[PDB]
Amino acid sequence: HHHFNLPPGNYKKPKLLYCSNGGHFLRILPDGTIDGTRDRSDQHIQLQLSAESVGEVYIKSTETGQYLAMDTDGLLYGSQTPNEECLFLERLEENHYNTYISKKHAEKNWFVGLKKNGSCKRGPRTHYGQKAILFLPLPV
């Protein structure tokens, strides 16, 4: 129930997921907390993406091995093991950016998103058209 415009680029190397909204890099902390930071020297912003199926990815911390995941109430968290809450539909947006929709809650359009203050957005609060959901994958 979603378009299938996919972004270029591959998953060969790790990446930083830069959010245009506030200019924060998606960060996965050791305690499982998820947020954003502007500090490019941070050791928890290096992410390795992998495709489980065409257009479906896992997003993992290279530093801690944790998987980005969105829970039943729309909150992002770091998971120690891969589960259905760790799969995201990676799509092109505005002919330029990358967006990540929770596969588990795809029917409700719950996106991975960062606010201007660097805090994560809760699933139900995200939607097409926001800058919070637009990411650019940059080399590490």
Q: Residue 57 — φ and ψ, nearest 5°? A: -130, 160
- Annotated binding residue 21: yes
- Cα torsion at 30, 43, 78, 47 (round to 10°)? -160
Summarize the chain as % helix, strand, coil (round to 5): 5, 40, 55
Task: Report the distance separating Cα 11 and Cα 98, nearest Å.
Answer: 13
Q: Which long-range contacts (CB under 8 A, 24 or more apart) does 105-108 make?
A: 105/70, 105/74, 106/1, 106/2, 107/1
DSSP class per residue in 56-121: EEEEEETTT-PEEEE-TTS-EEEESS--GGG-EEEEEETTTEEEEEESTTGGGTPBP-B-TTSPBP
Domains within the chain, CATH numbers bracketed: 1-140 (2.80.10.50)
Resolution in A: 2.0
Running DSSP on this structure, what letter comes out for residue 20? T
Handedness of CA 18, 24, 25, 27 (dihedral sign): negative
Token pair belonging to 99: 């967006």
Neighbouring CB atoms inside 10 A of 17's CB total 23
Structure determined via = X-ray
